[PDB]
């Protein structure tokens, strides 16, 4: 509301200001589900790595394990992509 | 005309140029109190006794010159012009006619 | 605002004589609820571009909770009606 | 958080004698009520 | 006046004039007082500016 | 490390251009006497500081004009740092290609959940920490996958940044060495990328990266660009949104002065959390939220429009998202104005991005590969250009 | 030298570690201050 006359000396006009109180105011990818289908069977073989390295089991039959559910996850896949 | 009521600059040459010429009215009577020239002894017509005056500014009468008072028979009575009305008349623009 | 009004103490700088510079470009400025001058007037280094000759401000005091006491013969120690309760609920050490 | 030792000074008091103008039972109840504030912010950093 | 420049000036006899015509306006509302000139095409008597 | 943010932003430039070195100096030594404030040259060539409030930055400005630079400095209206988010899940698999046209780079973009970024950048997680434990807190803490949380490559836009960039691939289409040596540079573009962003190149928070199959690595791979460029794009394909910082209001003060910062808060797109009294005074506590880009002004309107006397803290808060929609062409703002409930994220990000040097587009066409471009406008995915 | 003080002057905290002209004009600290203190207990040892 700095608007108008620094001084009212130089001109007759005792510039009272006001604010002019009559202005208007402002008025699906199927590639998606297959990387969800290939992440589930990724979590379900990693899943069987850890129950497996719990029980103390070797670390080749638990690979040949997770190679096998890797394969049957695939298939059950296949399957039932239908 | 309205190229020159939308003219800011314009107006305030025009404010200050007519307080200029009232200045110089003044002087010419070795005063300058605002009360001594109300705007009636500028802006009365010249039938009247008065300058006859002229305004492109927009100036104030106040209701303190606005009252008269007459000796009829039955005594005095002082006359005012609107009655209880607190805004004031102000002088006409030349640019509206 | 009920404050007094004094002549330009810098008789320099208006918008009118700049042209089209650009820092101060019109539409590269992100306008909000509008800066007043009170504003320019408490932070005068952040708000003015050459704020020149200005004077830093008290920024605050502490608030004075003090009240004076309307009535004439209560005692100089008294918890006042206007002054909030503490509960035994509100101290409440919550784990010991 | 910083693990940094800490140590509480209440200042003000003559405010409680001064300016509240409260009891001294209340100014009691007012120091804890600061203090388990404190305490209540200590642990809200780190619970348990 | 070009492209990107939508206002038209001069002056002549007194009066400073900018044109501004009634296809490149950014103000949806007109501020139109009795300063402003609506220019008016005669070929559809239309107010164009 | 400070537990407050430099979220307000001051332009400066020298008032005579000829003590533009000397400024500069002072602003070297603004940079020495205050630990939290940040200094930057743009490319624009504007002068930016940052600091933490209006009392801070009235300080740093005093310091600069009559301590150190002993100059006349030209200050700019106050402006707010700005980050950028996305909303929902990605629309597109997307991929870079390069010059050559051999490395082949698809990713995907995700809203992280609440509760990751604040742990990444309290040091909770820590990406110098072994995978197992990282691993471990992510399963124990948000249930994520186990090859996805031994998955996650990096953080951005540094090692302490909001930004996750992690491996969805599997084994048996793409072999790991060459994953891995691509992965290197992956992970710089990864960090350039996050750094800047691509709606107004500012520092983007709060999202997840998973790469995906089909992706081919062949040999070599020294330029960074390509990547980035795809995963701006994956910015513009996720719904991004522009999010701004907020200041948590704190009142100190009687009756009357909570009803003021009711009215006050109202017309400041402000909110009141909380309010009561302060026990054993009679004051009475008001703790809010507030935009800081809509804080200006606020104490001193708030303390002065008040009967009592009243105290108020603004410390910065939250980071929260700006309501409006970025990309949205067609809400426009006109000059002198603000912007309104709507339009306010398009204002906000038509109005940074060309005050610091660029074109008044999001260029959608210079983010992408041409034929990946015309696939995308021929399968819908896009706007009309 | 305080009591040799006069007018409002006199009424003025000494904030001694106040010594930023900001710091003297806003009436708050804008930075960190250090000193160094010879204080003494309750036994009687000073103690830095």
Same mark, same amino acid.
């Given at each position: 509301?700095?608007?108008?006359?620094?001084?009212?000396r130089?001109?007759?006009?005792?510039?009272y200001?006001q604010?002019?109180?009559a202005?208007?105011r402002?008025?699906?990818?199927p590639?998606?589900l297959e990387?969800?289908?290939?992440?589930?069977?990724?979590?379900?073989?990693f899943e !069987?790595?850890?129950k !497996?390295?719990?029980?103390?089991?070797?670390?080749?039959?638990?690979?040949?394990?997770?190679?096998?559910?890797?394969?049957?996850?695939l298939?059950?896949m296949?399957?039932?992509?239908? | 005309?309205?190229? &020159?009521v939308?003219?800011?600059?314009?107006?305030?040459?025009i404010?200050?140029?007519?307080?200029?010429?009232?200045?110089?009215? +003044?002087?010419?009577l070795?005063?300058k109190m605002?009360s001594?020239?109300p705007?009636?002894?500028?802006?009365?017509?010249?039938?009247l006794?008065? !300058?006859?005056?002229?305004?492109?500014?927009?100036?104030?009468?106040?209701?303190?010159?606005?009252?008269?008072?007459?000796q009829?028979?039955?005594?005095?009575?002082?006359?005012?012009?609107?009655?209880?009305?607190?805004?004031e008349?102000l002088?006409?623009?030349i640019?509206?006619? | 605002?009920?404050?007094?009004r004094?002549?330009?103490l810098?008789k320099?700088?208006?918008?009118n004589?700049?042209d089209?510079?650009?820092?101060?470009?019109?539409?590269?400025?992100?306008?909000?609820?509008?800066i007043?001058t009170?504003?320019?007037?408490?932070?005068?280094?952040?708000?003015?571009?050459?704020?020149?000759?200005?004077?830093?401000?008290w920024?605050?005091?502490?608030?004075?909770?003090?009240?004076?006491?309307?009535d004439?013969?209560?005692?100089?120690?008294?918890?006042?009606?206007s002054?909030?309760?503490?509960?035994?609920?509100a101290?409440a050490?919550?784990?010991? | !958080?910083?693990?940094?030792?800490?140590?509480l000074?209440?200042?003000?008091m003559?405010?409680?004698?001064?300016?509240?103008?409260?009891?001294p039972?209340?100014?009691?109840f007012?120091?804890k009520?600061?203090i388990?504030e404190?305490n209540?912010?200590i642990?809200?950093?780190?619970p348990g | 006046?070009?492209?990107?420049?939508?206002?038209?000036?001069?002056?002549?006899?007194?009066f400073?004039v900018?044109?501004?015509?009634?296809?490149?306006?950014?103000?949806?509302?007109?501020p139109?007082?009795d300063?402003?000139?609506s220019?008016?095409?005669?070929s559809?008597?239309?107010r164009?500016? | 490390?400070?537990?407050?943010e430099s979220?307000?932003?001051v332009?400066?430039?020298?008032?005579?251009?000829?003590?533009?070195?000397?400024?500069?100096?002072?602003?070297r030594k603004?940079?020495?006497?205050y630990?939290?404030?940040?200094?930057?040259?743009?490319?624009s060539?504007?002068?930016?500081?940052?600091?933490?409030?209006?009392?801070?930055?009235d300080?740093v400005l005093?310091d600069?004009?009559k301590?150190?630079?002993?100059?006349?400095?030209?200050?700019?209206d106050?402006?707010?740092?700005?980050?950028?988010?996305?909303?929902?899940?990605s629309?597109?698999?997307?991929?870079?290609?390069?010059?050559n046209? +051999?490395?082949?780079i698809t990713?995907?973009?995700?809203?992280?959940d609440?509760g990751?970024?604040?742990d990444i950048e309290?040091? &909770?997680?820590?990406?110098?920490?072994p995978?197992?434990?990282?691993?471990k807190?992510?399963?124990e803490?948000?249930?994520?996958?186990?090859?996805?949380?031994?998955?996650?490559?990096?953080?951005?836009?540094?090692?302490?940044?909001?930004?996750?960039?992690?491996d969805?691939?599997?084994?048996?289409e793409?072999?790991?060495?060459?994953?891995?040596?691509?992965?290197?540079?992956?992970?710089?573009?990864?960090?350039?990328a996050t750094?800047?962003?691509?709606?107004?190149?500012?520092?983007?928070?709060?999202?997840?990266?998973?790469l995906?199959?089909v992706?081919?690595?062949?040999?070599?791979?020294?330029?960074?660009?390509?990547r980035?460029?795809?995963?701006?794009?994956?910015?513009?394909?996720?719904?991004?949104r522009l999010?701004?910082?907020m200041?948590?209001?704190?009142?100190?003060?009687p009756?009357?002065?909570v009803?003021?910062?009711?009215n006050?808060?109202?017309?400041?797109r402000?909110?009141?959390?909380s309010?009561?009294?302060?026990?054993?005074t009679?004051?009475?506590?008001?703790?809010?939220l507030?935009?800081?880009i809509?804080?200006?002004?606020?104490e001193?309107?708030?303390?002065?429009?008040?009967p009592?006397?009243?105290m108020?803290?603004?410390?910065?808060?939250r980071?929260?998202?700006?309501?409006?929609?970025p990309?949205?062409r067609?809400?426009?703002?006109?000059?002198?104005?603000?912007?309104?409930?709507?339009?306010?994220?398009?204002?906000?990000?038509?109005?940074t991005?060309?005050?610091?040097?660029?074109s008044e587009?999001?260029?959608v066409?210079?983010?992408?590969?041409?034929?990946?471009?015309?696939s995308l406008?021929?399968s819908?995915?896009?706007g009309?250009? | 030298?305080?009591?040799?003080?006069?007018?409002?002057?006199?009424?003025?905290?000494?904030?001694?570690?106040?010594?930023?002209?900001?710091?003297?004009?806003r009436?708050?600290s804008?930075?960190?201050?250090?000193?160094?203190?010879?204080?003494?207990?309750?036994?009687?040892?000073?103690?830095?």
């Amino acid at each position: 509301d700095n608007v108008g006359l620094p001084t009212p000396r130089g001109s007759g006009t005792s510039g009272y200001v006001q604010r002019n109180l009559a202005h208007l105011r402002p008025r699906p990818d199927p590639g998606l589900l297959e990387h969800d289908r290939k992440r589930e069977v990724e979590v379900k073989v990693f899943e !069987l790595r850890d129950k !497996l390295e719990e029980e103390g089991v070797d670390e080749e039959e638990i690979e040949s394990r997770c190679s096998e559910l890797r394969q049957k996850l695939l298939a059950e896949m296949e399957r039932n992509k239908d | 005309r309205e190229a &020159a009521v939308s003219t800011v600059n314009l107006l305030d040459t025009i404010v200050k140029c007519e307080t200029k010429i009232q200045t110089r009215v +003044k002087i010419g009577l070795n005063s300058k109190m605002p009360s001594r020239f109300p705007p009636a002894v500028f802006y009365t017509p010249k039938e009247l006794g008065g !300058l006859g005056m002229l305004s492109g500014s927009h100036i104030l009468i106040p209701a303190s010159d606005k009252r008269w008072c007459k000796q009829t028979d039955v005594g005095i009575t002082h006359f005012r012009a609107g009655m209880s009305h607190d805004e004031e008349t102000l002088i006409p623009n030349i640019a509206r006619y | 605002p009920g404050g007094p009004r004094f002549e330009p103490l810098y008789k320099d700088i208006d918008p009118n004589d700049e042209d089209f510079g650009e820092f101060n470009a019109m539409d590269r400025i992100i306008f909000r609820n509008p800066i007043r001058t009170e504003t320019r007037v408490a932070y005068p280094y952040l708000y003015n571009s050459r704020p020149r000759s200005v004077h830093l401000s008290w920024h605050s005091y502490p608030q004075i909770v003090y009240t004076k006491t309307e009535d004439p013969e209560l005692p100089a120690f008294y918890f006042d009606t206007s002054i909030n309760p503490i509960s035994s609920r509100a101290v409440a050490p919550k784990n010991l | !958080l910083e693990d940094i030792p800490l140590t509480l000074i209440i200042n003000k008091m003559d405010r409680l004698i001064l300016e509240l103008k409260i009891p001294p039972t209340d100014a009691y109840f007012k120091l804890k009520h600061v203090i388990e504030e404190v305490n209540t912010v200590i642990e809200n950093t780190i619970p348990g | 006046y070009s492209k990107d420049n939508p206002n038209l000036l001069f002056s002549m006899c007194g009066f400073e004039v900018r044109i501004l015509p009634k296809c490149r306006n950014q103000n949806d509302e007109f501020p139109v007082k009795d300063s402003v000139w609506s220019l008016v095409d005669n070929s559809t008597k239309e107010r164009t500016a | 490390s400070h537990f407050t943010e430099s979220v307000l932003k001051v332009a400066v430039e020298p008032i005579n251009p000829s003590e533009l070195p000397k400024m500069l100096d002072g602003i070297r030594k603004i940079n020495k006497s205050y630990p939290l404030i940040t200094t930057k040259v743009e490319e624009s060539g504007e002068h930016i500081i940052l600091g933490t409030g209006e009392l801070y930055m009235d300080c740093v400005l005093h310091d600069l004009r009559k301590l150190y630079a002993d100059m006349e400095v030209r200050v700019s209206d106050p402006v707010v740092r700005f980050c950028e988010t996305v909303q929902d899940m990605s629309a597109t698999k997307c991929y870079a290609i390069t010059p050559n046209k +051999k490395n082949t780079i698809t990713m995907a973009a995700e809203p992280l959940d609440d509760g990751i970024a604040q742990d990444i950048e309290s040091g &909770a997680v820590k990406i110098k920490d072994p995978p197992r434990k990282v691993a471990k807190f992510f399963e124990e803490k948000y249930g994520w996958d186990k090859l996805a949380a031994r998955s996650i490559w990096a953080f951005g836009p540094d090692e302490m940044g909001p930004n996750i960039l992690q491996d969805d691939t599997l084994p048996t289409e793409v072999d790991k060495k060459r994953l891995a040596t691509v992965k290197e540079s992956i992970r710089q573009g990864f960090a350039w990328a996050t750094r800047e962003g691509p709606l107004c190149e500012e520092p983007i928070r709060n999202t997840k990266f998973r790469l995906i199959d089909v992706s081919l690595f062949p040999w070599w791979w020294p330029n960074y660009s390509d990547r980035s460029t795809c995963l701006l794009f994956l910015f513009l394909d996720g719904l991004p949104r522009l999010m701004e910082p907020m200041y948590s209001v704190s009142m100190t003060g009687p009756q009357s002065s909570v009803s003021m910062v009711y009215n006050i808060l109202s017309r400041r797109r402000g909110h009141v959390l909380s309010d009561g009294p302060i026990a054993g005074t009679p004051l009475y506590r008001v703790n809010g939220l507030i935009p800081v880009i809509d804080s200006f002004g606020f104490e001193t309107d708030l303390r002065i429009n008040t009967p009592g006397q009243a105290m108020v803290s603004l410390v910065f808060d939250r980071w929260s998202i700006v309501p409006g929609d970025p990309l949205d062409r067609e809400q426009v703002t006109r000059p002198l104005q603000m912007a309104t409930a709507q339009a306010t994220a398009r204002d906000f990000v038509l109005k940074t991005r060309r005050r610091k040097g660029l074109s008044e587009d999001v260029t959608v066409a210079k983010f992408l590969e041409p034929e990946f471009y015309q696939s995308l406008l021929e399968s819908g995915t896009l706007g009309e250009p | 030298r305080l009591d040799k003080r006069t007018g409002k002057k006199r009424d003025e905290q000494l904030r001694y570690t106040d010594v930023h002209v900001i710091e003297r004009d806003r009436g708050l600290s804008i930075k960190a201050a250090p000193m160094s203190l010879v204080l003494s207990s309750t036994k009687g040892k000073s103690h830095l």
